[PDB]
Amino acid sequence: VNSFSGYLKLTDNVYIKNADIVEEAKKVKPTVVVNAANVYLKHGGGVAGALNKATNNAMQVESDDYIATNGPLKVGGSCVLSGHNLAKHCLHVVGPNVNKGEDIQLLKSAYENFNQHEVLLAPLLSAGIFGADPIHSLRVCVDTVRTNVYLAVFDKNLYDKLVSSFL
Numbered sequence: 001v002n003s004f005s006g007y008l009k010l011t012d013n014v015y016i017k018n019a020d021i022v023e024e025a026k027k028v029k030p031t032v033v034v035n036a037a038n039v040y041l042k043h044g045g046g047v048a049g050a051l052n053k054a055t056n057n058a059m060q061v062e063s064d065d066y067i068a069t070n071g072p073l074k075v076g077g078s079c080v081l082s083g084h085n086l087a088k089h090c091l092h093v094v095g096p097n098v099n100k101g102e103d104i105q106l107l108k109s110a111y112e113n114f115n116q117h118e119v120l121l122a123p124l125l126s127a128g129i130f131g132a133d134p135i136h137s138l139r140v141c142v143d144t145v146r147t148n149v150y151l152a153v154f155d156k157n158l159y160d161k162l163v164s165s166f167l
């Protein structure tokens with residue numbers, strides 16, 4: 001039993017809700033919140049900009065030190081950093097950004113990072129400003145993640161389409 005509330009159950013392990021991931025994280029304080037990151041951990045917009053803003057830029061400060069030490073992530077890769085005031089940990093996961101021409105096949109690799117954590121609050125990877133089809137992202141999530149994932153989402157109209165089209 002966990003403290004996630006109001007989710008629709010899609011499969012044995014995948015749950016979904018129309019919600020602002022920032023507000024959800026602040027309420028639940030999950031062990032792991034997933035950020036929709038880029039390889040430079042430059043948290044400008046979408047989920048990343050919103051999460052970072054909610055940390056008063058502490059996420060960005062920590063991220064800049066991470067990059068200075070380690071260099072950029074890989075597309076499809078991840079790193080674990082602090083969750084600041086939002087969660088114990090933040091799993092920064094880089095899905096392919098179609099608006100940069102990146103290979104959508106890497107979306108499965110991106111979701112595989114979730115399997116290293118027993119429970120996660122997460123957005124749909126590569127959705128929104130990353131330019132992929134969210135119906136496809138949800139399908140890849142369900143077919144790749146085996147741990148317990150609570151998907152937040154932002155767009156109410158999109159949420160209804162995802163539920164109604166889910167197979």
Ligand SMILES: CC[C@@H](Nc1ncnc2[nH]ccc12)C(C)(C)O
Nearest residue numbers: 021046047050123127128154155
């Ligand atoms: C990852 C794409 C997604 N964006 C978000 N989802 C959940 N919480 C959010 N908070 C700020 C942005 C955001 C959407 C489906 C709306 O395009």
